[PDB]
From a paper:
The large terminase protein is a key component of the DNA packaging machinery in tailed bacteriophages and evolutionarily related herpes viruses. Typically, in addition to an ATPase domain which powers DNA translocation, the large terminase contains a nuclease domain which cuts concatemeric DNA, generated by rolling circle replication. Crystal structures of the large terminase nuclease from the thermophilic bacteriophage G20c show that it is most similar to the RuvC family of the RNase H-like endonucleases. The overall structure adopts the RNase-H fold.
Numbering used by the authors: 256 to 349, 351 to 442
Write the structure that this text describes.
């Protein structure tokens, strides 16, 4: 089969509380270090921010939004960063340059991961899936997160390019957000 996350058996599911748009697994612990994997979506696609607690290896918080302005999205990203001790952002902007200019303007500390190459995407995703297989990924036990992971698939094109995307016309911005966060997991 062409399911990307074959180690879904090993995905750990954590309880959470919905506090607005945030699913919260843990509040900020000052002795821990955090980072945010931020995927940005245009149109129907969602922007998703995932807070990884690097000291624990688990997602502390996840925030999802759809169809807000860039200024709105970045300002929610900022506030998320401040509430997790000025956590560094890994951002996927591959959305135009408008998002980048908003990130710079509001003064966010972030690495733009190109995500403009089949190869780079493969590495992010492969890394997430292998960490999952090893039992080192833990996410809020939420139907929406689990479904995107369950439905993420490999496809082949006529040129032999690999496509990694949701089954059908589903969304995969949660997969990418998670992949960006766990890119910092050691």
């Amino acid at each position: 089969m062409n399911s990307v996350f074959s180690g879904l058996d090993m995905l750990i599911l954590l309880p959470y509380e919905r506090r607005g748009t945030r699913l919260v697994v843990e509040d900020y612990r000052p002795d821990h270090i955090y980072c945010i994997g931020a995927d940005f979506g245009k149109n129907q696609d969602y922007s998703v921010f995932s807070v990884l607690d690097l000291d624990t290896g688990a997602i502390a918080c996840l925030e999802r939004m759809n169809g807000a302005t860039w200024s709105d999205q970045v300002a929610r990203l900022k506030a998320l960063s401040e509430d997790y001790g000025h956590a560094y952002v890994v951002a996927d902007t591959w959305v135009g340059d408008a998002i980048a200019e908003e990130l710079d303007a509001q003064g966010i500390n972030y690495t733009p991961l190109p995500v403009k190459s089949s190869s780079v995407k493969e590495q992010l995703i492969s890394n997430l899936a292998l960490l999952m297989e090893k039992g080192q990924v833990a996410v809020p036990n939420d139907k929406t997160i689990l479904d995107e992971l369950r439905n993420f698939r490999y496809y082949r094109t006529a040129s032999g390019n690999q496509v990694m995307r949701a089954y059908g016309r589903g969304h995969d911005d949660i997969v990418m957000s998670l992949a960006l966060a766990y890119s910092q997991y050691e």
